[PDB]
């Protein structure tokens, strides 16, 4: 009847799920949890998700988990905005671009992972190789945006930036400067940050919290 | 015209590729790569995948690289065998099974990683957590299966089942013996290992090669 959603403040693939639903514009109930108060490990998110994990969603008496399924399962069940272009060889490319950004994870937040994990321990013998992937995996995403000249897939907004911006808007929030090394990335941001559902669905809890800076250094 | 798929031995996410083809009963060519001698870094592949990596997928003009985006573009430029039911809210459990099997690579693997990237290393205090959290993982899918009885999301083998599999026959190849620990696992992937497709499938070094054996003592 009523899609409702728990979700957390930071979380890119709680983001994924708020960005379809406003981009749809399918209202909806929800549930702010709170990661620092371990709510998403409580018995209410059990019963729906034994991962205690964040998104949790149901819609009736559907219930998934996986960001990446609830986005496929809204995409199906609400398509009177599709997300989709409708020609099979240009939603191919929507689809390479969707998954295709589960690289940026792990090219580049390890780059954030690993000063942390182990800080003030050096390395740079080999933290040289991590900041220089995150270089090479970024430059994959500047041609694609070069390419297109608009969005991350095609010269329209579609479920690949649903999965691509959050990414940028967290390397941005640890401070990474795009602007001269990577102008369309930039550009990109830029334009996606001016988007009406993206105003509406930055992480709450950033507004008054310090940039952890971690990416402050990455250039 | 006719898909074209480069591929190599023993990787999870072409077996994925090649399942689906074969499942579909869809006739395509393919050249089978050497990763020992780097075949996948090779112009040819590059042309089509900048990241140097396998699967690369042709047909006609189209060109999609992501294992699961090259699987959804299948299912939706050859309809005639679905690897999806059509009620969309059983659909919804296909995706999210599909997904989350990401959890069993991360969860599971990493204990057949660590047991390599720093061997001869102990460190049982910590290796207690990996051993403990592969068990863990594996347990979800204990359930899933108990609960359906058949096969990983539904009765009927689905796309879901082309995600999950690879990744247990990979378990089984690094020696786990789950008979007894993991029954309905061990029935399915008995059940499985019996199905032509996978059969015509099966990784072709395994036959004689040894197996690394990461898992032996997985339980």
Not at 2 to 27: A, R
Not at 177 to 199: A, E, H
């Amino acid at each position: 009847s009523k899609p409702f959603v728990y979700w957390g403040s930071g979380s890119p693939p709680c983001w994924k799920v708020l960005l379809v639903l406003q981009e749809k514009k399918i209202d909806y109930d929800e549930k702010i949890i709170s990661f620092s108060k371990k709510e998403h490990k409580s018995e209410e998110i059990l019963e729906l998700n034994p991962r205690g994990q964040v998104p949790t969603f149901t819609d009736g008496d559907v219930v998934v988990n996986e960001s990446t399924a609830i986005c496929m399962y809204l995409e199906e069940k609400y398509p009177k905005v599709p997300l989709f272009p409708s020609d099979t060889t240009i939603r191919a490319k929507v689809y390479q671009r969707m998954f295709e950004t589960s690289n940026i994870s792990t090219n580049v937040m390890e780059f954030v992972q690993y000063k942390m994990k182990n800080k003030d321990s050096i390395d740079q013998v080999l933290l040289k190789e991590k900041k220089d992937k995150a270089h090479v995996e970024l430059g994959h995403w500047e041609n694609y945006l070069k390419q297109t000249g608009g969005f991350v897939a095609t010269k329209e907004f579609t479920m690949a930036d649903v999965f691509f911006f959050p990414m940028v808007a967290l390397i941005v929030r640890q401070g990474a400067n795009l602007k001269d090394s990577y102008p369309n990335i930039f550009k990109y941001y830029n334009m996606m940050m001016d988007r009406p559902t993206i105003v509406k669905t930055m992480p709450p809890h950033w507004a008054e919290s310090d940039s952890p800076g971690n990416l402050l250094d990455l250039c």
